[PDB]
Write an enzyme that holds these catalytic residues in place. Structure first.
Site, short mmCIF file in Angstrom:
data_model
loop_
_atom_site.label_atom_id
_atom_site.label_comp_id
_atom_site.label_asym_id
_atom_site.label_seq_id
_atom_site.Cartn_x
_atom_site.Cartn_y
_atom_site.Cartn_z
CB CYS A 15 -1.02 0.00 1.13
SG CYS A 15 -0.32 0.05 2.78
N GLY A 16 2.13 1.10 0.14
CA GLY A 16 3.10 2.17 0.00
C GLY A 16 3.22 2.78 -1.38
N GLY A 18 1.42 3.39 -4.51
CA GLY A 18 0.63 4.30 -5.33
C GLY A 18 0.46 5.71 -4.81
CG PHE A 20 -2.76 10.60 -1.33
CD1 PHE A 20 -2.75 9.78 -0.20
CD2 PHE A 20 -1.88 11.67 -1.38
CE1 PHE A 20 -1.88 10.03 0.86
CE2 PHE A 20 -1.01 11.93 -0.32
CZ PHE A 20 -1.02 11.10 0.79
N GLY A 21 -5.57 7.89 -3.76
CA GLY A 21 -6.57 7.39 -4.67
C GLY A 21 -6.33 5.97 -5.13
CB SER A 22 -3.29 3.83 -5.18
OG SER A 22 -2.51 4.76 -5.91
CE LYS A 38 -11.01 5.29 -4.37
NZ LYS A 38 -10.35 5.70 -5.63
CG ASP A 126 -13.59 11.06 -12.39
OD1 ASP A 126 -13.42 11.33 -13.60
OD2 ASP A 126 -12.72 10.53 -11.68
C1 LIG Z 1 -8.63 -4.19 -10.76
O1 LIG Z 1 -9.27 -3.32 -9.87
C2 LIG Z 1 -10.32 -3.92 -9.17
N1 LIG Z 1 -10.71 -5.19 -9.27
N2 LIG Z 1 -11.75 -5.40 -8.45
C3 LIG Z 1 -12.05 -4.26 -7.78
N3 LIG Z 1 -13.02 -4.01 -6.86
C4 LIG Z 1 -13.15 -2.81 -6.31
C5 LIG Z 1 -12.30 -1.77 -6.69
C6 LIG Z 1 -12.43 -0.38 -6.10
C7 LIG Z 1 -12.94 -0.02 -4.87
N4 LIG Z 1 -12.83 1.29 -4.82
C8 LIG Z 1 -13.18 2.21 -3.77
C9 LIG Z 1 -12.64 2.14 -2.51
F1 LIG Z 1 -11.78 1.12 -2.25
C10 LIG Z 1 -12.99 3.10 -1.56
C11 LIG Z 1 -13.86 4.13 -1.91
C12 LIG Z 1 -14.37 4.16 -3.21
N5 LIG Z 1 -15.28 5.14 -3.73
S1 LIG Z 1 -15.61 6.49 -2.78
O2 LIG Z 1 -16.30 7.51 -3.59
O3 LIG Z 1 -14.40 7.11 -2.28
C13 LIG Z 1 -16.81 5.98 -1.52
C14 LIG Z 1 -17.41 4.73 -1.65
C15 LIG Z 1 -18.36 4.33 -0.69
C16 LIG Z 1 -18.68 5.19 0.37
C17 LIG Z 1 -18.06 6.47 0.49
C18 LIG Z 1 -18.39 7.34 1.58
C19 LIG Z 1 -17.78 8.59 1.66
C20 LIG Z 1 -16.84 9.00 0.71
C21 LIG Z 1 -16.51 8.15 -0.34
C22 LIG Z 1 -17.14 6.87 -0.44
C23 LIG Z 1 -14.02 3.23 -4.12
F2 LIG Z 1 -14.54 3.32 -5.36
N6 LIG Z 1 -12.29 1.77 -5.97
N7 LIG Z 1 -12.04 0.70 -6.76
C24 LIG Z 1 -11.28 -1.98 -7.64
C25 LIG Z 1 -11.16 -3.28 -8.19
#
Ligand SMILES: COc1n[nH]c2ncc(-c3cn(-c4c(F)ccc(NS(=O)(=O)c5cccc6ccccc56)c4F)nn3)cc12
Length: 292
Positions: A15-16, A18, A20-22, A38, A126
């Site tokens: 987790c080191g 990426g 931010f946002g990774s 994330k 987005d």
């Molecule tokens: C090959 O990549 C992959 N394979 N399978 C996968 N499954 C899942 C994912 C995967 C999960 N997230 C992911 C994540 F971890 C954390 C947050 C988000 N969204 S949020 O808006 O911040 C958000 C979501 C829900 C409640 C929120 C409440 C307040 C603020 C923001 C909130 C997110 F979208 N992003 N990508 C990638 C893959």
């Protein structure tokens, strides 16, 4: 707004590494659950207002990590990966009209929930194929719906990369309505149909200029069924007020799925890519050349 201790996570991917946002695949140890994590610079308590959103076509919130300097949001992990990776792989050759209709309806439904049904109205801003993932049973899940409000810092990196998905009013920081997401949805549907990267190889600022000033839109192959072509044109209107809502898109898709002619026309189109790929490539060559 469940708190998940950083020590309760077993990371698969370091987790080191990426920015931010990774997002990292992980195991939530006390729950024996696969999860996505994330990485965030910080998270505000106010973000709890979105922790109650739940819908089969949006990624499911699990918890938040709140141990400085480790901040993050934890969600379900969709076992089949990202929609973008799938589309741009040879696996996408399997797609038929039924596949596309189901996936187009999935995204539309998730976006209708965010826009109209959730306890808090969410405009994504987005939406793109990289922000959609594929669960184990093929259900599509929308990701990053809270980024624009709660961790906008994560959206900066390859903003240029995202220009193909962005509505003109978003590129211009003009007044924005919910229909900015309809524009992006139109691009996602174009990707599923053509299985091409939009505006591939084009400079992002050049894309943004063409979209905003010249009303340029992605090339729709001439053999693309008229119902799909028309849906894309509606999603892509310059006047944001004339684009359909997601309620309207869902109704359009339902009408298309009752059209007995469509499956043969669409499947013949989908499987004919060797024929019409040159039409897309020709526009790209033209736009690149004219730039020169
Ligand atoms: C090959 O990549 C992959 N394979 N399978 C996968 N499954 C899942 C994912 C995967 C999960 N997230 C992911 C994540 F971890 C954390 C947050 C988000 N969204 S949020 O808006 O911040 C958000 C979501 C829900 C409640 C929120 C409440 C307040 C603020 C923001 C909130 C997110 F979208 N992003 N990508 C990638 C893959």
């Amino acid at each position: 707004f469940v708190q998940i201790k950083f020590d309760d996570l077993q990371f698969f991917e370091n987790c080191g590494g990426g920015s931010f946002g990774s997002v990292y695949r992980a195991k939530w140890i006390s729950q024996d659950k696969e999860v996505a994590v994330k990485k965030l610079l910080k998270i505000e308590k106010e973000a709890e207002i979105l922790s109650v959103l739940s819908h089969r076509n949006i990624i499911q919130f699990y918890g938040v990590i709140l141990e400085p300097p480790n901040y993050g949001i934890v969600t379900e992990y969709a076992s089949l990966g990202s929609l973008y990776d799938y589309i741009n792989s040879n696996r996408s050759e399997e797609m038929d009209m039924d596949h596309i209709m189901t996936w187009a309806t999935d995204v539309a439904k998730g976006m209708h929930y965010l826009h109209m049904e959730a306890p808090v109205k969410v405009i994504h801003r987005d939406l793109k194929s990289r922000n959609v993932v594929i669960a184990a049973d093929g259900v599509l899940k929308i990701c990053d719906f809270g980024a624009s409000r709660f961790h906008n810092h994560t959206t900066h990196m390859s903003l240029v990369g995202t220009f193909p998905w962005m509505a003109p009013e978003v590129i211009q920081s003009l007044p924005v309505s919910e229909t900015c997401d309809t524009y992006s949805y139109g691009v996602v549907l174009w990707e599923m149909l053509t299985r091409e990267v939009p505006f591939k190889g084009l400079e992002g600022l050049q894309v943004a200029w063409l979209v905003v000033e010249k009303n340029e839109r992605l090339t729709i192959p001439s053999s693309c069924p008229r119902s799909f072509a028309e849906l894309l044109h509606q999603c892509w209107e310059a006047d944001a007020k004339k684009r359909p809502s997601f309620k309207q898109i869902i109704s359009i898709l339902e009408s298309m799925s009752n059209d007995t002619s469509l499956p043969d026309k669409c499947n013949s189109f989908l499987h004919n890519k060797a024929e019409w790929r040159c039409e897309i490539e020709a526009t790209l060559e033209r736009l690149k050349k004219l730039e020169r």
